[PDB]
Amino acid sequence: QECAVCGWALPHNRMQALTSCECTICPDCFRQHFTIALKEKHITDMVCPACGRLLSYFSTLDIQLRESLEPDAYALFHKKLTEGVLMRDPKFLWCAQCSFGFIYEREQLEATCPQCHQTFCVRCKRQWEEQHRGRSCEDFQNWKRMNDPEYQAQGLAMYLQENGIDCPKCKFSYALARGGCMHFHCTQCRHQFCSGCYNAFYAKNKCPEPNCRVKKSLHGHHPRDCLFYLRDWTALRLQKLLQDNNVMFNTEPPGCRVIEQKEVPNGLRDEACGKETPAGYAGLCQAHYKEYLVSLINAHSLDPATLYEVEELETATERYLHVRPQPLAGEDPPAYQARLLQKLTEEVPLGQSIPR
Amino acid sequence: EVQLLESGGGLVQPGGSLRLSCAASGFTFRGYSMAWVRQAPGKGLEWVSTISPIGTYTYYADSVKGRFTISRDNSKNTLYLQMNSLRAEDTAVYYCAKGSYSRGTPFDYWGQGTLVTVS
Amino acid sequence: EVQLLESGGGLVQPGGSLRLSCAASGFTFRGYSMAWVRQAPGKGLEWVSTISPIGTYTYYADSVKGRFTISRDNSKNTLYLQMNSLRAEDTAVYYCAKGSYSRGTPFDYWGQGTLVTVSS
Ligand SMILES: */C(=C\C(=O)OCC(=O)NCCCNC(=O)O[C@@H]1CC/C=C/CCC1)CNC(=O)c1cc2c([nH]c1=O)CCCC2
Ligand SMILES: [Cl-]
Ligand SMILES: [Zn+2]
Ligand SMILES: [Zn+2]
Ligand SMILES: [Zn+2]
Ligand SMILES: [Zn+2]
Ligand SMILES: [Zn+2]
Ligand SMILES: [Zn+2]
Ligand SMILES: [Zn+2]
Ligand SMILES: [Zn+2]
């Protein structure tokens, strides 16, 4: 319990425990030796003043030098370490779990914090496990996300929130689900648009589309494959369009848990949907399950017109082509349906801005 | 996205007790460690304490260890800081901090802060 | 005593570019890392980027990676932030910060921010 250079009798907890040589040096002589070694000697002369015993020594010594040295003496130690040993700045690591900063100049990918003594990846900063060895980092975090019970317990609700609502005017991203309400209001730029097709909701007398009969009312214009229209389809007919194109869809979970944002006095509070989750709807609302089916339809660019009857084709022609169709002489309902379906799919494309 | 809101600051007599809170949203609270930091008047920012993502490990600065107690409620995405036997040197703006896994910073988000004054 | 003065803020159209600067004094500029932090409307502080003392290492937040570029001129104790492809979400008060090596504090002082707003 004596200082190995001055002999001063101090408790062990009141001296500098030099990690490299395990001496016991009082704070005064610790300051004295390393300050003169930097201001008048070379950094290679920074051995222990008691005994006299590489870059992992400087990493452990940097911690003790930060505590006892002066701010300007500590800056001179970085300068000579940079200008004399490394030819560059030292790589300073922050431990994400204990917030301790330390120098790490080793070639290994896993670094151990000198404070909390936990191992983490130098690029990930996630806690290290043997499953990360030999695996890419993106593969590792996606492995922990695929094996988290609380993550998987939410089910398809996490899929609807990943499909973010991007405001087409200000490009702000909202990690939300569309649900049943299609009229979206952006708080950043006040733009009003549909969350399914990203088309504009026009105010009174602001719609420029020709042959529109609701110009004096707030409304938007949606393609035939928008959630605005396909929400009116039954869940059965929606998934038959998926089945007709060999697209899988959930009916069982792998109150509705989809997170919504309600208005509260102190901003916005996250609240689950909590609606009735019928059987065969993957444990979600009817509105959110239909949103889940429509996202699969839009991702594969499935055309709902392939299931249109004759009346539905006449409606789509008057809406998107602004021409009332009429059967030709010699046509039967199949020929009249085939003609309208062909001209509709040739002249009117699907959603040119629907998230796919 | 990320939002950290502090609460509980105010004027406290010396030797008094105070409890700060931090309401977190916009990220998975249970997946990151949280920390409290403070800045005394006219001084540099000083780290107070840090709690592990699920709460098994707690770290403290030497001047507040045993006097302050950090805790979190992942069920409610809330960080807490119980401060006992407050001294005049505890007067500072106390900031809630969210830990980060991005290179070059131990924290990527800080809150608005709450002012704590010790008479 | 540490002194940090920001400069370069203003009104920018979406997709535009802006260059912030920060004049530092009161400490050895070459001995510390420097960082930019910002305050979005109704928020606290969000880390933007950090540069090593001589510039060997540059770090960026994910939302600004590839769009922002941090740099420093130790000859004049000036920190820089080149911001390209500015979005409406980049609207914030941008603060100049002096780095620290102590645990729990990547920066110990930040200056009088300069406001950057992106029209929509
Ligand atoms: C339409 C929302 C809806 O359900 O319509 C019902 C209605 O008639 N009024 C809305 C009832 C209040 N609840 C609500 O969803 O408020 C939202 C956001 C909060 C305040 C902004 C304007 C009101 C709309 C579909 N749109 C949305 O759900 C939605 C969600 C957000 C935002 N805008 C929206 O239009 C912006 C902020 C994030 C959440
Ligand atoms: Cl780091
Ligand atoms: Zn001694
Ligand atoms: Zn020795
Ligand atoms: Zn650690
Ligand atoms: Zn990794
Ligand atoms: Zn917008
Ligand atoms: Zn639409
Ligand atoms: Zn119209
Ligand atoms: Zn629902």
Residue numbers in the entry:
A (entry chain A): 697 to 749, 758 to 958, 968 to 1069
B (entry chain B): 1 to 119
C (entry chain C): 1 to 120
Reported in the publication:
Here, we report the selection of single-domain antibodies (single-dAbs) based on a human scaffold that recognize the catalytic domain of HOIP, a subunit of the multi-component E3 LUBAC and member of the RBR family of E3 ligases. A multi-protein E3 complex called LUBAC (linear ubiquitin chain assembly complex) is the only known E3 ligase able to generate polyubiquitin chains via M1 (Kirisako et al., 2006). The active core of LUBAC is located within the HOIP RBR domain, which cooperates with a C-terminal extension (the linear chain determining domain [LDD]) to provide chain linkage specificity (Smit et al., 2012, Stieglitz et al., 2012, Stieglitz et al., 2013). In contrast, RING2 is structurally close to an IBR-fold and encompasses a catalytic cysteine that forms a ubiquitin thioester intermediate before ubiquitin transfer onto a substrate (Stieglitz et al., 2013).
To test the utility of HOIP RBR/dAb3 crystals for ligand soaking we sought to obtain co-crystal structures with covalent inhibitors bearing different scaffolds and a range of molecular complexity. Ligand-bound HOIP RBR/dAb3 structures were solved by molecular replacement at 2.1–2.56 Å with clear electron density for the linkage between C885 and the beta carbon of the unsaturated ester. Inhibitor (1) and analogs (2)–(4) are all based on a bicyclic scaffold containing a pyridone heterocycle and are accommodated in the active site in a highly similar manner. Inhibitors (1)–(4) all engage HOIP via hydrogen bonds to the backbone of H889 and H887, as well as through aromatic interactions with F888. In addition, compounds (2)–(4) engage in H-bonding with the side chain of H889, which adopts a different conformation in the HOIP RBR/dAb3 complex compared with the HOIP RING2-LDD structure (Johansson et al., 2019). The structures of HOIP RBR/dAb3 in covalent complex with inhibitors (3) and (4) also shed some light on the role of the extended ester substituent. The TCO-linked ester extension of compound (3) adopts two different conformations in the complex, highlighting a significant flexibility for this part of the molecule. Density for the TCO moiety of compound (3) is very weak and was modeled as two alternative conformations. Furthermore, removing the majority of this ester extension in compound (4) maintains labeling activity at HOIP RBR, indicating that the extension does not contribute to molecular recognition by HOIP and instead protrudes toward the protein surface and hence is available for TCO-tetrazine click chemistry. Consequently, the observed increased labeling activity observed for inhibitors (3) and (4) compared with compound (2) is likely attributable to increased electrophilicity of the α,β-unsaturated ester.
